[PDB]
Design a protein around this ligand. Structure first.
Ligand SMILES: CCCCCCCO[C@H]1O[C@H](CO)[C@@H](O)[C@H](O)[C@@H]1O
Length: 158
């Protein structure tokens, strides 16, 4: 089991960490969602689907910088919605193919009432997402840590 980003940055068998740089909607009004769709950014696969089933969770997700200060968060994992920053490990998604499959994570971030102006700064860390991988084969229990950075400012009109 291993993962890679849209630009080809890989985390190999056994886990590790990688940076993900995302473009963000430049203007987000109070009442609207800023959507960070990581399912277009992070892809994983099973290296031995003939014999092994891989299990994958969002073990936890943390918010940083402007997202922590200025937004109210929800994370969607494989179609189900949870608080973000997270309060529990998600159910498992099965990886049973050698063909790359998206990691089905999306953040839905809406401005808090106090938000206004540059609510997320270009280049800032906005989230850390921990992908936890196990299997039905051995005792492997690996973390793939995704550090999410903003490519641009996000402005909340006042
Ligand atoms: C003849 C024995 C072959 C043994 C292949 C084990 C390969 O293990 C890797 O790939 C497995 C399948 O993706 C993962 O479950 C495991 O954690 C690791 O990433």
């Amino acid at each position: 089991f291993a993962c890679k980003t849209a630009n080809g940055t890989a985390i190999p068998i056994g886990g590790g960490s990688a940076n993900v740089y995302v473009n963000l909607a430049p203007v987000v009004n109070v009442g609207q969602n800023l959507v960070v769709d990581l399912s277009t950014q992070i892809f994983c696969h099973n290296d031995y689907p003939e014999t092994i089933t891989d299990y994958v969770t969002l073990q936890r997700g943390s918010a940083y910088g402007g997202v922590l200060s200025n937004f109210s968060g929800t994370v969607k994992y494989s179609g189900s919605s949870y608080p973000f920053p997270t309060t529990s490990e998600t159910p498992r998604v099965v990886y049973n193919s050698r063909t790359d499959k998206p990691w089905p994570v999306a953040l839905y971030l809406t401005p808090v009432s106090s938000a206004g102006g540059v609510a997320i700064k270009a280049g800032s860390l906005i989230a850390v997402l921990i992908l936890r991988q196990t299997n039905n084969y051995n005792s492997d229990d690996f973390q793939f840590v995704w550090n999410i950075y903003a490519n641009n400012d996000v402005v909340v009109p006042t």
